[PDB]
Amino acid sequence: EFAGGLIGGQSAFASQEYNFDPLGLAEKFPEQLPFFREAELKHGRIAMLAWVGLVVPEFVRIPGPEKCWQASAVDAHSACVXXXXXXXXXXXXXXXXXXXXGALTQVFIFCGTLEICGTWAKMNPMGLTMENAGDYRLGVNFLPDEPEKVKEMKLKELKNGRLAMLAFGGAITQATLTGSGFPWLY
Amino acid sequence: RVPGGKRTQELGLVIPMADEDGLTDGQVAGLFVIALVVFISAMDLAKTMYNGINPAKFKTSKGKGYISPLVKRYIENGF
Amino acid sequence: GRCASSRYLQVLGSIHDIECGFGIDNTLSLNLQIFTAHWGHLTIILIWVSSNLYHIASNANYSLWVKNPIPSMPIAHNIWDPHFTNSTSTPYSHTIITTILIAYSGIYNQLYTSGFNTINQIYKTTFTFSCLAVISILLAKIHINTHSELLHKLASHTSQIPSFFQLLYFLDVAISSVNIRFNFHTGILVGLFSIGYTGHLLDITIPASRAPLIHTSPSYLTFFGGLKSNTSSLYLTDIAHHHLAIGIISILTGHLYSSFRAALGTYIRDILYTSHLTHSIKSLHLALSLILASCTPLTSTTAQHIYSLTPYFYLSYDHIYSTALYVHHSYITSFLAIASHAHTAITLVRDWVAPLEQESSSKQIRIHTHKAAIISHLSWVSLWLGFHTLAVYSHNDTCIAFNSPSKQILIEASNGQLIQQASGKALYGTINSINNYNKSFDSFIHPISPGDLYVHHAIALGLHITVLILLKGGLEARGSKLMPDKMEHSFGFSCDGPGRGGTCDISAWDSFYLATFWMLNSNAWISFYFHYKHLTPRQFSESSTYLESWFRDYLWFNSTPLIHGYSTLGANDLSVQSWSFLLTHLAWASGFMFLISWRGYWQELIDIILYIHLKTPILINLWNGDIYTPLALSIVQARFIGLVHFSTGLILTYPPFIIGATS
Amino acid sequence: SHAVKIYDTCIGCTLCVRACPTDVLEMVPASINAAKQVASSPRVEDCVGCKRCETACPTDFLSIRVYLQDNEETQYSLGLDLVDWS
Amino acid sequence: KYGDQRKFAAVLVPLTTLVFPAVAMGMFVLYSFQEDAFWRIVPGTKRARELDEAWREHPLFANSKDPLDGLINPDDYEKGLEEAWERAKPAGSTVTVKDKLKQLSKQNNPHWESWRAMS
Amino acid sequence: YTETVADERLFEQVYLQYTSEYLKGPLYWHPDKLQGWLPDYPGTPMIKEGKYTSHVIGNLKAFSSNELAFLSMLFFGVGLYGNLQFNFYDPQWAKVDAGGFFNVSYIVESFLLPISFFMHIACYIQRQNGK
């Protein structure tokens, strides 16, 4: 069985299986395949949200700390974190800014808390397997009750995630190279 | 002070003494309270180490024991 | 029947030998007792730290020493002894003021470097460390209860199958697990402790050493070198960066073994099984031996590098701190070094399973197959070093007594000089490629002379002989040609009788007893070398190739201030030093009789004394001796007591000499 | 009390029995040697521990072995004279 | 003044270096005459017997002192040993495995741990 | 028949030969036979036939000998390049001394030399087992 029987390896021309793995990592690391699918789904979801929030600020910009909330999508990370002391280390000597402190570290700490009580709580305490890889039981009531419908919905999630990962890479690289608007072209 | 040794006399090394008290009596008493706590706890620990483990507690002691869920994992993870 | 007077010595000789306990029946009890003892010992250490901090806070002058450290002297604690003169003034007090003692430990420089400025901070630190002692004792109680609760949970435990008895071996998996312990030690206890100390330095130590600066920016991590000019110590920025680097390296290393999950990390057993090891890692004596053998290089390098590269403020400016610290840590590491061999011998006696006769698989097996070759070659190198060091020293002594200093044999220390030249070229290349050059390294490289070569050969001789005695005891602990059943007996036993040639000092414990004398002698040689080179580098460089120089220009000459301490002319602040000097001489000589005179003489003497007591009018009607029968000390007890007296005398005779000579 | 054990290598010398100062050892019949006798230690409670038996034993390594047990000493194993433990 | 801590010393030093040591020595010599004295190193104490029996009462440590403990199916082991000895039994030898093991387990050492008779 | 010493020795040999084989089996359960003790872990035999089994190299057990050889040589080249370009050619000490920063590529690469050593060890181990 290819890659422990995970959704995502089936071709689209049907009657065929893309089972894309030129490096053969699925057979080299079968004990970390659930972690591989966890990472793939996490990257896909983060990249979907990242592409959406790479397009949107070109139109609307939340009015806030003017130090951030300004500039191109490229100059929006190092600007919305400011000259932190070393890296993601709050300046306790001068909280309330007045020189150097973060503006996203709140997003960072929220992501850390959610991740620890999310993936870490799923793996360390009293358990992830092949089937429950990306399944955090979030919005499963919306999932249809049919064996193939769930499988095709998961496949659509996976393929949208891969497309969003590649798309975000291309979009951010083009924006860095050129600037410009949504087309991200010279 | 009457110094001894060649270097103290030939260099003028001196030992200053504070004219104040150092610690007030209240601070010494505050330290002695926690020292007494250490002392009581240490006497209890010495008693427990002297008597050692009692395996026959399961015949008389209440409860049913407990193995923490991580201790079970550490048991079955290996040695 | 009941016991005799030797019961006290017999009990106290194994008072902490938890393996020899009578109620102890399993590794669970042994491991839990050891863990609780560890907790109590940590509590003792914390209370000792809080003690020093309190006495510096209350009965001391830290607030004044911090202002003018170079010429000032710290105070250890007050003197309250009703035996002193209730009149006049002792030489340890400024007339009517109280009596004080000068601290030679070095805690003042430690606290000053660490960022202490006020007595109040030291008081709060004392309170916190007493709190930590409470916490340690409560953790001991907690773990005793948790293990007893597992034991009680065996009242609701059954596998429904005959394999349920397998749980017997996993009850102490909390203590006996190795992979988790290694992972968490090397990661947390080493790397993250270093990283936390880097944080401490960046937040306190560097801020409280210079003018106010930026918000602890990454410019606080420097790569200067050594010996900041003003304080004559390492740069605090360099120390913080060093701890940061060590912390990062050890944190990365700590993810090696399979600690919490079975899917990450390699097992230590599999690491050893595919190497030249695969030892019995379940032995507690083996682990103790190989970690005592780890604290030994650490403590020896601590002694070397506290002096060579002084890390504390104004530590080099104290003529007594520098010698006392070095000698103290050298003695500590010598004790740990001989401990490693003693517990290796105990491991071979008690906790080592060997194949039938020929299976050369275990490392101890391969060592034991050719143990005679090891001991013979160690004897050869020891004999060579002793012969050719004593003979050259004798040549120098004789030819310099005969008015011929130019007839000496002075081998120029060429190999050490080459190593020093290479290191100096490397350091100078480092310095010359700096825009902030003109740095100093203090005594990292020192002038090396023929006297240095001869003393190094003497030190190598001492180390070789100590290792020879200890290694012979370890290898023949399980049986030698003279006594081919030694593993059936205890680790320490009296002898094997006067027959078969005579068998005094045959146990492995007797090998340790013999080796402790050589450990003390080698340490004395090392300490004499360091102290002599510290007192007068020039006179050591020229006149130290003949032993008469060591006898006259060091011992006889430098003992002048100490003996003059208390006399029929008045007393100095060295009076305690001279009194302890004489007391330690008495202790050293008192242990000669426990070593030279042996039991039977004294047993007859005790029989005569007991005859007197049972013959004295009143005693006989109250005490017939049937209860706690007085007997002469047994043979092993006698050897140990003589060894204790000898060790105490030899060790404690030196600090008075150090204080008298340097202060 | 000590522990005096007799091993199969005994050749019935009787020297160990003769050397014992407290009559701990004795000769018993056996069939494992040409002498048809081996030593025995039926009364090791009287064994002071002098190890004269080991001195007298001529086998390559002693057929009789005395194991000292100092935390075990009784009044007989100590040779107490001025004092009675009974 | 720099003194005024000697008010603590004048009580603590005499106390902890005279009263406590003397009380400790008296308590130690009193403890020396208890039947429980040094029960962990001195053989033949009552508490040692009680502790050993308490360990033996635990279901895990019942057959812990037996050097032969571990054989999951001792009947299978004995049957296999008997079968292997039958094929190697020398000529008309009359020794069986059962009585051979029975007489190899029974030795004659009356003076072993005889100190388990007083307490 | 009387039990001669030779017959007793024969029983000793028979008993030892049988029991030494029996105790290796699943029916003796000694603490020295636990995991982490003498016996190998259940699914991970380390040494068989006097040869390092494929399970020694851990997660690399599935790698081919050619893949490990290529990785070994590539890592050796990259790590040796990093070490030589950090120490002797293109030194970074002067650049970082004046307030600069290390060429992070050199630092990352230089750690691939011992990795390459163990990678080529693993390549040989894989080749021996025919993988």
Ligand code: CLA
């Ligand atoms: C300096 C070392 C030293 C010392 C102190 C002693 C002391 C003694 N030896 Mg001895 N001995 C020694 C070395 C020494 N020996 C050596 C190297 C050998 C070579 C083998 C011998 C061989 C030897 C033999 C063969 C004999 C002795 C005997 C004696 C005893 C007779 C002297 C006596 O009773 O005085 C009293 C003991 C003193 C130490 C005098 C000083 C007492 C102090 C200063 C006063 C009390 C202090 C005070 C109470 C403090 C309290 C303690 C504190 C914890 C509170 C005595 C206990 C003989 C004996 O026991 O016959 C009676 C005997 O037969 N010795």
Ligand code: CLA
């Ligand atoms: C990977 C996702 C991601 C990341 C890292 C960022 C990061 C950033 N965004 Mg952004 N954004 C995103 C997605 C993301 N965005 C999406 C999906 C939208 C569309 C609503 C926007 C719309 C948006 C605007 C309008 C602006 C930013 C801005 C910024 C910058 C300042 C931070 C801020 O306040 O954002 C604000 C972001 C939001 C209010 C949208 C949050 C939506 C999150 C991603 C969904 C919640 C995820 C949660 C963990 C899952 C549970 C909920 C789920 C059921 C949906 C920062 C670089 C500001 C800036 O300076 O731009 C240059 C700004 O003005 N973003």
Ligand code: CLA
């Ligand atoms: C035939 C004489 C002879 C020979 C060839 C050797 C050879 C050896 N001995 Mg040696 N030894 C000898 C006599 C001899 N020994 C005597 C008489 C003693 C008693 C003092 C020793 C005591 C001794 C010790 C304690 C050690 C050796 C060791 C060694 C070995 C290393 C070399 C060494 O240390 O030499 C140095 C030799 C000495 C220090 C002993 C003194 C040399 C004597 C005086 C020479 C006597 C020669 C003899 C008079 C010739 C007469 C010839 C005539 C009759 C025709 C080597 C195999 C060492 C070893 O085992 O390491 C591998 C070792 O540790 N030997």
Ligand SMILES: CC(=O)O[C@H]1CC(C)(C)C(=C=C/C(C)=C/C=C/C(C)=C/C=C/C=C(C)/C=C/C=C(C)/C=C/[C@@]23O[C@]2(C)C[C@@H](O)CC3(C)C)[C@](C)(O)C1
């Ligand atoms: C209680 C509760 O809540 O339950 C929850 C459960 C759950 C599951 C969390 C939920 C959900 C689902 C969610 C939130 C789904 C969101 C999905 C998103 C945002 C997908 C974006 C994909 C973007 C792509 C593919 C971009 C593709 C972009 C491409 C290909 C770009 C292509 C470009 O060529 C173009 C077009 C321009 C060129 O210049 C270059 C580039 C950029 C490459 C619910 C509904 O909330 C309910």
Ligand SMILES: CC1=C(C#C/C(C)=C/C=C/C(C)=C/C=C/C=C(C)/C=C/C=C(C)/C=C/[C@@]23O[C@]2(C)C[C@@H](O)CC3(C)C)C(C)(C)C[C@H](O)C1
């Ligand atoms: C830049 C910047 C920042 C940033 C950033 C970020 C997030 C940068 C992210 C970069 C990122 C995310 C880059 C992804 C690349 C993905 C690639 C190359 C995929 C190739 C995929 C290929 C070539 C696929 C090929 C195939 O399809 C082919 C042709 C046939 C198919 O049958 C099969 C396959 C699959 C084989 C900071 C640091 C945050 C702040 C700073 O201030 C500004």
Ligand code: SF4
């Ligand atoms: S001396 Fe030895 S060999 Fe002779 S009878 Fe006695 S035990 Fe046997």
Ligand code: SF4
């Ligand atoms: S040690 Fe002495 S008393 Fe004991 S059996 Fe041997 S000879 Fe007899």
